[model samples]
Target: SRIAKDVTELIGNTPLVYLNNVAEGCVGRVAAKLEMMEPCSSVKDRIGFSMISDAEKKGLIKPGESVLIEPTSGNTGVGLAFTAAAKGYKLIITMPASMSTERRIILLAFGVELVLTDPAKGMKGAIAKAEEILAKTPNGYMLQQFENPANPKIHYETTGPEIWKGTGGKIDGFVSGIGTGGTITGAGKYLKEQNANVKLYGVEPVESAILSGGKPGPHKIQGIGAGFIPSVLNVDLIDEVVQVSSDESIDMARQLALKEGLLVGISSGAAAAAAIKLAQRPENAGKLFVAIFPSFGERYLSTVLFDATRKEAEAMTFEA
Candidate 1:
């Protein structure tokens, strides 16, 4: 069966690829579940579909009349935009002004309304604005990703099973960046269920180490490190927490592309860094470590990840 279903049907079954070059120095093998291959180019698509479908099932939204509102850094908004368009529902995504320009453009292209919040306040600020908007709009429904159970439930059902199958149940460890805590909480829970020895790690920004007891300073890596613990995050499921700085993460993102040809986003870079760090552990020898690459780097072109490279290139040309 080539395909007959709509784009919504293309939401899952993303490739799980091994990181040969990037995992060079690590003691164990490293693999990345390329979640960017989904219809909206991010793992958030799974939750976007789940939340919207669940809302409809609960009669919380009406087709063509209900407005779906969400607060996201970028990926989730993009995912929801695709779902809203397909389901005949209106979408209004509230995002921080700090988000990449390409993300905003994509939402607009999907005919979804965009509301920008102060970058200083970050995602929490965006959430506040989204709640305010929801209160004002007559039929607005907030598909609150952070608090929603469906966000993690879908991962538990689909992503965990896919990873178990992809790795042939030989995976020794799992690593993922925490956004809504959906991936770590749900997928980690499921993998641990399969094998009690499978270690689970949650990655976060060093600057905004809310989960690790540090102040939430601004970091360039979007979608992960919310400065506050997400409601859906089941902290008990995680065996360890790893923190990586924005510079290290962005550099690793570049390395994944140059070394392994995997141009994953910054959060993916962070997860990869954490996974590599975990693999380097003395006890993790010869283990199979897997991490989630949330999205492609295309959405981050306008951010420092690319702008710094472009500026350096321009400087070299000018000096010549």
Candidate 2:
């Protein structure tokens, strides 16, 4: 386990742990991967590597070339920064000025240039600005993870297989939140293919349950819920879409830290809470269920700092 390797090599093979601490009433047993353990601190590692590799393969971006940009809530930027640094490419990230100081420092630390977008408008504003900048830059290749199939391909190729092997094929259900649709679509498809009976669940933000046919609102939960369906999302593969409320999601996050010693981020807490519900279903009893925990909690401090009231936090959207 201590062997030396390139940072990208640390992308997969995350450990799957039981959810006994939180899944008391569930009929089936629940399991979750510690994905934030990856080198870049989020499930976006899979997308980052896949997107970059696909770009290189297609001759869209070569080693040492600068990548134009896209905006991220946080984790994706870190993932791209790591990918860029490792492969000798430059990356420019456009983000709301309201992003966590820690995230900005991390991106800067990796030498990825940060372009500030309007904070009031959220990520939508940031992306719009980034696109404008990318269009103006000469020869700038925009590695838009949202539309890239390669983003999900990484999880499909590695995450699903790893979970299957980790559980000895006992897994009966797979669940994850959808942002770019990569992890859920990729891993969900691969896992379902292994066992047709397996259920694939997607977590949605209560504020923007648009994927589940709900209306949009300002949601505080970052990094997983998007207002619209991303191009990479394969809705056909999803078995269910569970909506998570910002307040409840944050409560779950605090509980994970205080009770389970997980110190997980909000997205993982939301995914894990939904996974527990899936495991408790009568039909799921006595079976293995897995939920993907995408990242850690420390990354959400800008809008919803640790001490902020959950209600106050929900008002801050990562939209642009």
Candidate 3:
């Protein structure tokens, strides 16, 4: 038996669960790497600690007194909140007001100070606020997860290896939503190294199909599709960009809960939807497909995942 010294030590080595029902009718098998098992409840936990520790190694942060500011959707904020608290650093998060209620409550519980920005401005607004804070505070250090090399590097070292080893180096393809592009770039890079034939799909909201050469627009699927290309994203590494509509993702999420018993976030559902698409392809029949479920549905308590009546209304509206 082993005991972790702290929550940070419990960041990686999440288990992969095979899709029992979510991949129904597809010719191949689909397995989801449950990243929500991390201490901060998302794959961002890897980057949250990675960015901070990298900064410390570079002498950019003074640890106990240095102020770390970051702009995030929700899961990253939660990850940074817990990591910063444990590492003796002060954290300030600039977040969109439209994020789920559970995320806000969890951040507050971690004693993180929040700077709420207009949801309409999207992640860009939060980035602006974080920059403003950095300019005003002399001791402030902004890890800028969107552009930080450490973000992808951590996944390259830990996440990609875990998937490669877990699948016994037989993984056929990978699917994940492009939030900051760390997961897709890092893990995709590694898996491709193990097998050059592995296809990598970067899932984005159909409405904000910026990666697929479409205009950016508002979408309900959080933590992915940040309305623009993130600097850390390596486009060449991705074999294709899969566009998923908000309704399709939400429906897939509902199905995951009802059929697969895997209660995951909307972004995870979007990836699952993309994985199903890949599995259905004639070229990919009987192959092993792997997708990442970044977080669980617990943080989405305010969203449509748990609301039956709301789902019914949305379905009715869709029919009309």
Question: Model 3, 185-225: lDDT tens per residue?
Answer: 99999999988998898999999999888998989887798
Clashes of 2: 15
Clash pairs, model 1 backbone: none
| Local distance difference test values of all predictions, in order | 0.89, 0.81, 0.89
Displacement of residue 13 (Cα, Å) in model 2 is 0.9
lDDT of 3 at 23: 82
Kindly indicate the candidate among 1 and 2 with the higher lDDT: 1
Clashes of 3: 0
| 41-100 per-residue lDDT for model 2 (tens digits) | 688887778788888888887776546477775688888888788888878898899876
Which of 2 and 3 is ahead in TM-score? 3
What TM-score quantifies how close candidate 3 is to the native fold? 0.93
What TM-score do all the candidates reach, one by one?
A: 0.94, 0.91, 0.93
